[PDB]
Design an enzyme around this catalytic site. Sequence first.
Site, mmCIF file in Angstrom:
data_model
loop_
_atom_site.group_PDB
_atom_site.id
_atom_site.type_symbol
_atom_site.label_atom_id
_atom_site.label_comp_id
_atom_site.label_asym_id
_atom_site.label_seq_id
_atom_site.Cartn_x
_atom_site.Cartn_y
_atom_site.Cartn_z
ATOM 1 N N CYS B 107 30.262 12.214 8.429
ATOM 2 C CA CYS B 107 31.611 12.300 8.995
ATOM 3 C C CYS B 107 31.392 13.009 10.332
ATOM 4 O O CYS B 107 31.577 14.218 10.433
ATOM 5 C CB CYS B 107 32.565 13.128 8.106
ATOM 6 S SG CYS B 107 34.317 12.910 8.590
ATOM 7 N N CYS B 110 34.359 15.279 11.795
ATOM 8 C CA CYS B 110 34.819 16.500 11.147
ATOM 9 C C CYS B 110 33.940 16.940 9.988
ATOM 10 O O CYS B 110 32.928 17.615 10.189
ATOM 11 C CB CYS B 110 36.280 16.359 10.691
ATOM 12 S SG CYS B 110 36.647 14.951 9.631
ATOM 13 N N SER B 111 34.318 16.563 8.774
ATOM 14 C CA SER B 111 33.540 16.957 7.606
ATOM 15 C C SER B 111 34.045 16.250 6.364
ATOM 16 O O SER B 111 33.810 16.713 5.248
ATOM 17 C CB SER B 111 33.648 18.469 7.397
ATOM 18 O OG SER B 111 35.002 18.851 7.198
ATOM 19 N N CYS B 112 34.740 15.134 6.563
ATOM 20 C CA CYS B 112 35.290 14.369 5.454
ATOM 21 C C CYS B 112 34.202 14.011 4.451
ATOM 22 O O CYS B 112 33.079 13.671 4.824
ATOM 23 C CB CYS B 112 36.024 13.136 5.977
ATOM 24 S SG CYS B 112 35.136 11.922 7.005
#
Lengths: 228, 203
Positions: B107, B110-112
């Site tokens: 991701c 972001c950090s999904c």
Amino acid sequence: MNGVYDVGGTDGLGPINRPADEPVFRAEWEKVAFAMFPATFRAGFMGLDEFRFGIEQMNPAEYLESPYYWHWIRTYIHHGVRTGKIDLEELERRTQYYRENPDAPLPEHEQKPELIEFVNQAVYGGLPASREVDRPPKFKEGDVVRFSTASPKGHARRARYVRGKTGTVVKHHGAYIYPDTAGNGLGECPEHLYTVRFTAQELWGPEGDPNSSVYYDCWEPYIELVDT
Amino acid sequence: TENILRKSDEEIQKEITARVKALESMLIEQGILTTSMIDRMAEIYENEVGPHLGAKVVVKAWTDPEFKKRLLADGTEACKELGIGGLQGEDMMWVENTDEVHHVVVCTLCSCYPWPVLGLPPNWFKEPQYRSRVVREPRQLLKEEFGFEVPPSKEIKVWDSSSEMRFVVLPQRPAGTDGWSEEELATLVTRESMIGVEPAKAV
């Protein structure tokens, strides 16, 4: 926005820091930071897309080296102030208070069953972003498309490394909340969503891996037809 | 990396702790945050939702061709067959590793991550180093960082989850496991194998 947070393709960030194992929460404050997500969401501080936009507006130097959950705190404060639900001056005063008195108690408060209900419902029920729209999909599997070179100053999911690049539609997933409007407080305005395939050569030129491709999700407005 | 401008980890933690407790005191007074809500969320991701759930999906697919087809057709609906799904996993698309292809998920924006099947992501997955490099030098990263060498002739497909669609890797079943039970097979499925940075455990 063309924020530093959009790191795909960035060189020089260094080796990966990966301990053999780690706890889910490294400190108690992380648990609080984590739980504040459903709390502020339920309170109308922001939606998921706006949540991300708040983090994207962080000081880049702070974003790159601060603990992950600190990013969450920054966005909470960002929207708390934006909506006027958080008084910055009061927050600063309390921060100093807790700096000097770390073990001071939290405010007396009643527990609320509705909040636990919300948590259980959101966790096991989820918060689906899928939506139905009246327009049919503009593209289909096999279509060759080009990613837009637009550079919105507000929130969007347009990684700089794919802009202006050409790829092939791999799958149409139906319509979903559109970040370009949602993350900027302009509503869901759902758009059809597609996964598009870009060869490494297309993305990086000769420096790209000869046998690799990157799959990236594109909302309809992000792409235009090259070849059906 | 070294930064001569950065405070010590100790000072950083002390400052953050104070800022978080202050914000927490305000949200509590507003009536939108409570200690029980905090504890419930933490409890769920420390003991209930984790990669063992994703492992159950994997072993079922490894031992049930039809389930596997359903899993690859519609990840969300298939996982619901096992009571698995929810927050940040509302839309899942599973991708299968083969002798010709290797999948790896990231991701970059972001950090999904697919919480319902993998729980909360480890810190390295959310950090700049992995996110920046994996879409640009996936083969070298896998070798250098995870000791996983993927032959040049084998295609590496990197999945950048820029939308709410969550991508999960169905690793190849390790050789020498014919007739193994689902419980025995599960011991080979790792969080890493479902992100694509490592294959399932050998032997």
